[PDB]
């Protein structure tokens, strides 16, 4: 058709990849994915069409609400007699005439109740909705007004809520309807258990294996069978062969029997020199149709990632390298006269139910022969008490083989403490179909666990699809849209661990992206920002294709953002190329020259901010745009806020564009800070952090939010009393007390957060202070390594200029904030551990092994008691 060719052009421009390149791939998994995923698209579109048009406005403008309607004490105490003061704005004439009506109402009022009170005091002389003044956020559901994050924050900050009445007809008429069309491209045996053979694989020859004859005599193929990074048997190598003729023609035998192969079994192989590795690759032993791979097949290998001292790379992704001009290794698997598939769930349930009756046969005498079969043995309360103690340890405490045998034995009891499932799963012998079949039935009826606990089951050491299917069940039952957005970074990353294109995790995330457009925005950009990475570009490219067909009109607004970013990349590439050594003035002349060409001049104005799509980026104030003093030439960009009420929120939107630095680390560290702030605010501990906008949009390219009215400590010094005098100066009179209080709280938060996270390299140019006293750190490149950090400059401010701070009462109140903030994060240690664990396959440099993560066990003292952990942080703080 004709409309389909335009839509494919729009999809291709958004992804940076022509749709026809997807059509060219003859891998049937690819084509099946492109068709089979389309039911998620129709379900999502139908969810947006049931109860139109309010259904599609919910989609485009979801409520921005907190997790729970309950308010902490320090929040409620902001509100005398449970009453909030809210200003409601109405425009009487089409000339944008302002009329404010101030209201005093209960915080739990639905937006309809706030419209009623506003319309009654409008007349003192069901057709409207509330909009946040200054940005495209709406209050469409019947949430308690205090539960919306904007209203909650206005209570938190002691700032005045500014809202606007707007008729429903206004918003609805500006939301175009979605005409999702199904595309022209959707319309297109013996079990393993009955095979008693040992596994053997044929390593025949290798091509494109050019390598320097210097320091190379012989080369050889190292293989290994793994299940999620743990070997199922011994690694078997091939025999050394000459470098000029890479032929082995060798069948390798492995200590594992075929019916015991787990579903997620993978062949991890590599080519190694003689005694270093050259290139690696992984193959799934089963395809996406549950078929034991049989026959000849060739694998294009991957270059060794810098830092890989091992010989195999079992955590790297699986599949052939798309660059077919790389080392290519040829393999052959046994055919067994028939198509071999993995047994049905009914066959597994039979074998497992059979296996439980074999237990009651064996009785108590036989139970002695195996420590893992302690089911028949009677269980003292010590056993129940040890299982409880095991279930309460962090996801990275070592589980001994005694404990693993102890866990398998009591699995019918572990169902009663479902939080122990992760450690239980780690106790299975995954190379025993007898045990695994029996674990499946446990997982089949396992009680749901918290989303924060289930996310662990999606990282790099739970590859089994039944384990991961249970994990998605949990998120799909308890994970709120708020928490989904909060954790979206990690949930996108764990898609890389998935063994196949079509899988329950991606169907979950895609459906939520296509029913919640705040989520779909960052879903898009987190995927788009890594299309340059060839290990996942095809995976994310196909997933982006299906998204762009069903997200609706927002595809047009996304392309609008993509070309904006693309012009900024091209323009900054030309600066780093042709004017990199010129003065900043010569660079600015060239910048203003390039920016005033007509094609560029609208590509970058009249689009939505990728940092926050509620923010509209109107006209560009070139007079306020500058190349920044930093290296890599950051662009200070300034747009007009075209909103009618821009003066009540922010009149200019200031964003830094940075080309050259990997921003994934800043984006992650600020996520952790935001979550830590959320934990502290829920426990009534008002420690004000500033998790500040930072989005990676591509390979060492991204956007950074500007916080206004802030200065670095180094500039403020331009005496240890110097900082405090600046704060006294900026904050005279009654403001002094609130300002000192704001600095002490923000300092406590960042002291604790930087200590826990091992945030080193902190100097007076990495710590800024706002005019209202808000301290906050910056440039989070390095992290997880450093001791507790408190300069004398900070302490003088806390004690309001006193000589000894330890002596004053304010330092006592400062410490209790830290100890409480420290113990609050420690009580949520599993959350942060799992979040970092999910980031291991990301390819991020500073999160590549569990050794990198072990440092938060040390700073949080998880192997000690909450007493002795507090004393450790008692000491770490007084060490100054």
Numbering used by the authors: 107 to 231, 248 to 310, 324 to 409, 419 to 862, 873 to 939, 952 to 1046
Sentences from the paper on this structure:
Class IA PI3Ks signal downstream of tyrosine kinases, G protein-coupled receptors and small GTPases to regulate cell metabolism, growth, proliferation and migration. They consist of a p110α, β or δ catalytic subunit and a p85 regulatory subunit (further referred to as PI3Kα, PI3Kβ and PI3Kδ), with a broad tissue distribution (p110α, p110β) or enriched in leukocytes (p110δ). PI3Kα phosphorylates PIP2 in the plasma membrane to PtdIns(3,4,5)P3 (or PIP3), which can be converted by 5-phosphatases to PtdIns(3,4)P2. Here we report on the discovery of UCL-TRO-1938 (further referred to as 1938), a small molecule activator of the PI3Kα isoform, a critical effector of growth factor signalling.
We next used a deletion variant of p110α (p110α AA105-1048)30 in which the p85 adaptor-binding domain (AA1-104) and a C-terminal membrane binding motif in the kinase domain (AA1049-1068) were deleted. This construct lacks catalytic activity but, in contrast to wild-type p110α, is stable in the absence of p8530. Co-crystallisation with 1938 did not yield crystals, however, soaking preformed crystals with 1938 revealed density for 1938.
